[PDB]
Amino acid sequence: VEVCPSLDIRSEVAELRQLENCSVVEGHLQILLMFTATGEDFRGLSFPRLTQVTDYLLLFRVYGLESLRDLFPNLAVIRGTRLFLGYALVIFEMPHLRDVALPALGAVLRGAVRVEKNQELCHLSTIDWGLLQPAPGANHIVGNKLGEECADVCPGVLGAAGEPCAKTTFSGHTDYRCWTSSHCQRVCPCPHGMACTARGECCHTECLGGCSQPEDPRACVACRHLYFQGACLWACPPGTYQYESWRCVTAERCASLHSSTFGIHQGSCLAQCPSGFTRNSSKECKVGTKTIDSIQAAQDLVGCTHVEGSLILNLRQGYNLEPQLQHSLGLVETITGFLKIKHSFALVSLGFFKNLKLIRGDAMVDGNYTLYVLDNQNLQQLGSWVAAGLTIPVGKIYFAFNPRLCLEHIYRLEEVTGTRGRQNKAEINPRTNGDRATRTLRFVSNVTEADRILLRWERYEPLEARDLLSFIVYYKESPFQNATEHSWNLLDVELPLSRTQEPGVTLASLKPWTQYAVFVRAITLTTGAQSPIVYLRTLPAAPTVPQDVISTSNSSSHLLVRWKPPTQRNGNLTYYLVLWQRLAEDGDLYLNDYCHRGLRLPTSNNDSFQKKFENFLHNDFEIQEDKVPRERAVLSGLRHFTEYRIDIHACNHAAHTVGCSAATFVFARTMPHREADGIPGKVAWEASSKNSVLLRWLEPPDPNGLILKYEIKYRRLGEEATVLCVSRLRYAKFGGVHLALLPPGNYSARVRATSLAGNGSWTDSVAFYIL
Amino acid sequence: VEVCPSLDIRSEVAELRQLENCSVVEGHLQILLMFTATGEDFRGLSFPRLTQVTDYLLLFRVYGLESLRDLFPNLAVIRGTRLFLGYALVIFEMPHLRDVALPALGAVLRGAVRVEKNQELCHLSTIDWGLLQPAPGANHIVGNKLGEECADVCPGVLGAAGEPCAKTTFSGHTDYRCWTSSHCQRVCPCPHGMACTARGECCHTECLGGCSQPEDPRACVACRHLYFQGACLWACPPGTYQYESWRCVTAERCASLHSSTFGIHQGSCLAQCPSGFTRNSSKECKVGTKTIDSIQAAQDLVGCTHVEGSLILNLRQGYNLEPQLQHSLGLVETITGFLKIKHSFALVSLGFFKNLKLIRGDAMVDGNYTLYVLDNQNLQQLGSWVAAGLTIPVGKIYFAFNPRLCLEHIYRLEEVTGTRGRQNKAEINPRTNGDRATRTLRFVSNVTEADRILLRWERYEPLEARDLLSFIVYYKESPFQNATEHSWNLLDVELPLSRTQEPGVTLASLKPWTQYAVFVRAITLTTGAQSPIVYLRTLPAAPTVPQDVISTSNSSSHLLVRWKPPTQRNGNLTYYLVLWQRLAEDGDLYLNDYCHRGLRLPTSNNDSFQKKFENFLHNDFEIQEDKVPRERAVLSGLRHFTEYRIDIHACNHAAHTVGCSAATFVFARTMPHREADGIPGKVAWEASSKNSVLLRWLEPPDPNGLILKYEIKYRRLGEEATVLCVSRLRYAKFGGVHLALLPPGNYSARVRATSLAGNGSWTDSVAFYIL
């Protein structure tokens, strides 16, 4: 019946009176921020005419409101075409709201319901959203008043005065459904979505929220699909098209309601044509002040051609956003409002406005400013939308702090704008933008050494050398090629006292194989000319020795060696050269008698006039090698319990250099072999007529290092044993041992060989009798 | 005769004509930057009238000049009252200048001579400065043409046409002195400073540079001390005073020459009165544009009261310069020019202008700007020279980027200036200055825990809580109290759903004993109120275990232990608790027979709906202990070769805490005693009738750990020895050893005791005979 577009009500109860004649609100209905209100203002206030809301219903902080049973006694259907953050019925921070009280509500077509942070709200558990929403699983109803603190008194289970109504299960809690203490939910037996009148009979399917005559689309209270001349229809056949997805309207009527950019494609009279389409009766772009904060917020204007509004670009966290921004922006030909850029750290150029041509400046920044560029920490190019393209009928251009942008670009933009004298300082002020940035000097010779660099640039002609003074060289170690002038190392170069022999400079005390960024600048008498930054790499050299070399022997034939890379690589390390050589035991051990004067056993390895004048003017043994590409190395095929000298070198690309780094040396020893010290075979015994016996045994084949002494243990059967040591010389003198002056009887003898690693293994006992 | 004030000549030879009538230049004479000149322009140019220069003579890059014998043929005396960088005669980078050629020069009263960087200049070695300057040791004459490339041809040694003159030593090189190839230096026999005429006779002392009548001050060519009416005088007795320290002038004449700030104190008509003095016939301050770059450059204006000029303050490297600057500046009452501040990083306040009251703005920055404050990265106070003190008759105030200064101070300054509507945006523009900075929230409770903090601030009254939303808490770990808001840790605090129970917040996952800076801020509906930054320290806790404990035994009774401090101190470490306990050897060693089944010997130790809604709205065994305050510890009074278990704890101020850190344990062993293993006394021997002998020896008193076996070595006199092992049980069974069935003869026996540390010492040989 009525139009009643979307409305928001704030700050006064009188403003609520604009809903007197409304019947179907064609948009969102918001009621919020009503502090100066009591419980009596809403007591005598009612809007029975309202029966439908298209977008959503929002209530937020409406003081003095106790129940909605009077505000919306006939609200039946919420279409939910446009949802507020995915919700169709929002109630937030509402004091004194005792109950929701929507007795006439029929169904929520789309969207969830959010009711939370209500101080004194109860009677919510007796409400089931299954018969209202087609998917009540998205609702969020928490944080209200405690369920135990409010009694769900209604005409049902409790002894109330009203007649009880039926019950319906919601989530397994089959209880009574009661909207309020008096009004309760309406339930009728019929398929879902079939609206029923007060008589319990459900009417024709297109009826929604109520009816008055069974099976009569003309008598419906709210058309489910389409509304047309008081009738409910599936579509709009004859000559009309859908409007706001809830009614049928003629082309002329919808055109009048939309009064040039409206489209009537796909049988819908939309206010704006979609992407890739033009006006058709069978791309202009609108926004008030769009703040582009990131790439994800810049996809609203894809294909936008005539943007009637203002843009505020503020990008601080992005990087390389030129093509992403140029994908959306770039087809814009007219910005009616103002272009404003603040604190755009991410942006580096304004080249995404390729076909920007006109800014009429209907809306402008406060202070008669059309173009407002401020605080762009790194902006250089300023795009290519210049050279007789732009024109500004009204407004002033304000350019500020693009310090990486020279004033030449702003001056060119001002010249091609057609006006120059409109503005003055503090808006295109010097010493304000472009502080961090013209004759350019050219280097003619660059000699790189191991720790020195020699530079020579072009010499000025006598005409241009009149106003020339000593040069200044800035050089600094930059590993990457992303260095620029504002940590720079300073040098002063006095110009040569001749018309030839170009100045040049020598830089010393430089680490080998390093990249240095260097550039020169002339003093040029008055307050001028400088050379582009050049990156030069010094010659490599031999690296340093490896650090902290350690070794271990996990087995009897392996040696794991680990160390650390050198301090300065002096290039790129390609590999390590590892040399090992077997070391033989000293000859002292082969001559000393070790029965006495014993020794420790080695263990296995286990783990200024010029400046002042300028200022005044201005006013057994074998070497084996390996090639280890990684830090750790493993040596295999080594002898058991033998000393090894390990040499390690560090090698960069030193084919032409003096060679690899100086060797670092360590000493390691392999673990002893367990069974290498056993005496081979069995010991033999013989007797002699002169009350004596002889014992013989073969030496171990591969002893650990060497055999120092042989211990022979012998005893008479049944008592203690008396061991005896035999040196190498004593054993080799007779091939064994002698035992003389023994009383008659039987004896058991055992032998054991001791090596440099430790004790051996006792051999089999030999039994010999002497009589 | 003439006045001829200080003059500088540049860019043209015609401008040199302003010296035609000059006789005595009362100031510096500079000739520089003459590129468009040939050798013929100066050929016919001469100034014979000039005979004296007061300050200095500067020549710099005057092309086409070959000799000064024509430019200044009569220049005699250079007073050098004011020196150019300490020099009185500067010749710099002069091409084609073949020779200095100052034949008439008499003396340089004060200052050094600098002649360098001359392409084709020679004839300098034949010049002695002893007769010219009173101290020629400060001269700097290098970098000229090579001495061997120019021949010092003069009428002396070489066969020239001119008559030779006398010679005088300069620095031990007694050679001829010749100014040029024709003119040579004038030398007369008389005391130093006595000017002589062309006849070789030296005149009265006051004469200087020449004379015409012997002993006649009236006929002098240049008065040495004072000049008065053509006469040379020591002082100015009758009615005149010194002017420029070279002449006597009447008070009225000098007043006329100085036309109000001139002073005539101490018999000198100075143009400016000294510090602490006023105008007297028996402090105004002048400068064009003084750039104050540092403290050392700010001492020119000490006591300056009326500064008729402009100041440009630019201080970027200083710190706490408020009192140093207020020592000099502060008495200024009027700045006629403009006040400009750019890039003043060091400055933090403008409080050194205490009595600044007026700025008439005669000189102003380009663009009608009197006060120009720009790019002050940290400025807060803006001084106290406000509240009806200042007044600006003409000019506009430009305030920009004092981001630590709120706009309230600028607005107050504008209001007390008396004018507000003169300026507009882009000069006091918002969002331009004061970005980094009003109701203030107050904390009411702060509970600190070991790793948690609980905060509670005041609750808004219902009148002021209408436009209130969720709070935002910024907290970050700041070891110092120099933290401020722009790395801050963010938290969102939803306001409580009641009129009481103030919001508060809990911060968890915090390191113990750390200082956190926290402050809260209200969202306050529209775009407001925040609390001051508060620093809170969490409660301490027990520290962590020490890391990397190592120990060594440098002697037999010492143990040096070194380790590393724990990772987290959890407070301030006061000391370390070190516990050591003696460990006894295992009982296995006391029972096994070690003649066989030998063992290794141990070694000594050696080394989001809420946010979206807000956005929408906005649009043997004994424990011993020590106390080590330092990292390293030393244990003394320990047994020799005994195992010790060392426990180390870390202790902060843990009197009320659970205690010190968990103990870390290590095992160490002291070095063995050298002579502890020797057998006491001498071994004894006895015989028995049954062809046997017995040997006895006492056990060592304090063996290293324990004695494992005794090795006895015996032999027949003259051949090899046969050693024998005896276990502890075998030795203790009979108190010694038995040797049975020995052939008759003499024998020598020695004993040795082996301990857990190693071999012992052989005792004295015992000789025993068996028959």
What does this protein structure show overall?
Two copies of one chain form a homodimer. The first copy, chain A, has 771 residues and is mainly beta. Chain A has a domain at 284-417: 24 nucleotide stem-loop, u2 snrnp hairpin iv. U2 a', Chain A (Alpha-Beta Horseshoe), CATH 3.80.20. Helices cover 5% and strands 29% of the residues of chain A. Chain A is built from five helices and 42 strands. In chain A, the strands form eleven sheets. In chain A, strands 1, 2, 3, 4, 5, 6, 7, 8 and 9 form a nine-stranded parallel sheet that branches. In chain A, strands 16, 17, 18, 19, 20 and 21 form a six-stranded parallel sheet that branches. In chain A, strands 25-24-27-28 form a four-stranded antiparallel sheet, with no helix packed on it. At the A-B interface, helix 4 and strand 39 of A face helix 4 and strand 39 of B. Chains A, B: Residues 620-771 are extracellular.
